[PDB]
Hints:
Blueprint: H1 3-19, H2 49-57, H3 64-81, H4 87-105, H5 107-117, H6 124-139, H7 172-180, H8 187-204, H9 210-228, H10 230-249
The structure holds ligand VQS.
Amino acid sequence: TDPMVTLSSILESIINDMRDLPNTYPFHTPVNAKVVKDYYKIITRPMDLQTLRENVRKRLYPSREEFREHLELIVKNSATYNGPKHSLTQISQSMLDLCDEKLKEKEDKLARLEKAINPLLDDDDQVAFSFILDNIVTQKMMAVPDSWPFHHPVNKKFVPDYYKVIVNPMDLETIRKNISKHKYQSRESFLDDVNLILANSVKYNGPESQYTKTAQEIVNVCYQTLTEYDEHLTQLEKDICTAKEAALEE
Ligand SMILES: C[C@H]1COCCN1c1cc(C2(S(=O)(=O)C3CC3)CC2)nc(-c2ccc(NC(=S)NCCO)cc2)n1
């Protein structure tokens, strides 16, 4: 199976357990700014259990620690807004304490899943594979004529109605951010995010736009360059893959 699917289900069940701790209701959904009118003029990175759950379902957390990092925002934001010793900051700390409890309670299964999901540290093949990708994206995919609208995340001041329509933004710069963290062990993982930039454009611009026409030329220039390095990428994928499965048996 996908260990990431397995890891996500374990995180989701921890979210359910945290949602069912008593008096946690203020943290279940994002703060209604029309109610708590000053909340978002103080809290710059809000977090809540519903947003936490959504991020799990978007496969955003490949390990215990990045999950725990967003969950700890809930505690930190309460300590900033309500106060460090306020009763709700204690209720939020109660959720984080329950999460730490069950993360260590299932520690060795989680560590094996993390080994299967994440890149191997100081791997020569993984370094080389990521390096190839950040030259397909820049020297080719970013070289498509009039590709610039997809080089970066959309600025909400220029397309105000974008993030209210696109569940999963994706651009060529966040791909590069993923490449530098060695997210992509295979070509499978990499091309999913690439085709999403095209799927996003058809969902927003539609096939009645030139921007959508350029969005697939970015996709096509990607597949061509990948086949162009296919013999070298396959060996890189095999070497990464075999170095990985050795870390899992051991
Ligand atoms: C194609 C759409 C649809 O989905 C995919 C992405 N997207 C984008 C993406 C972007 C950028 S950006 O946001 O960072 C921008 C650079 C600061 C990502 C690079 N810019 C824009 C855009 C939209 C409208 C205008 N119009 C103006 S300035 N009119 C002035 C009066 O004539 C300008 C630009 N659209």
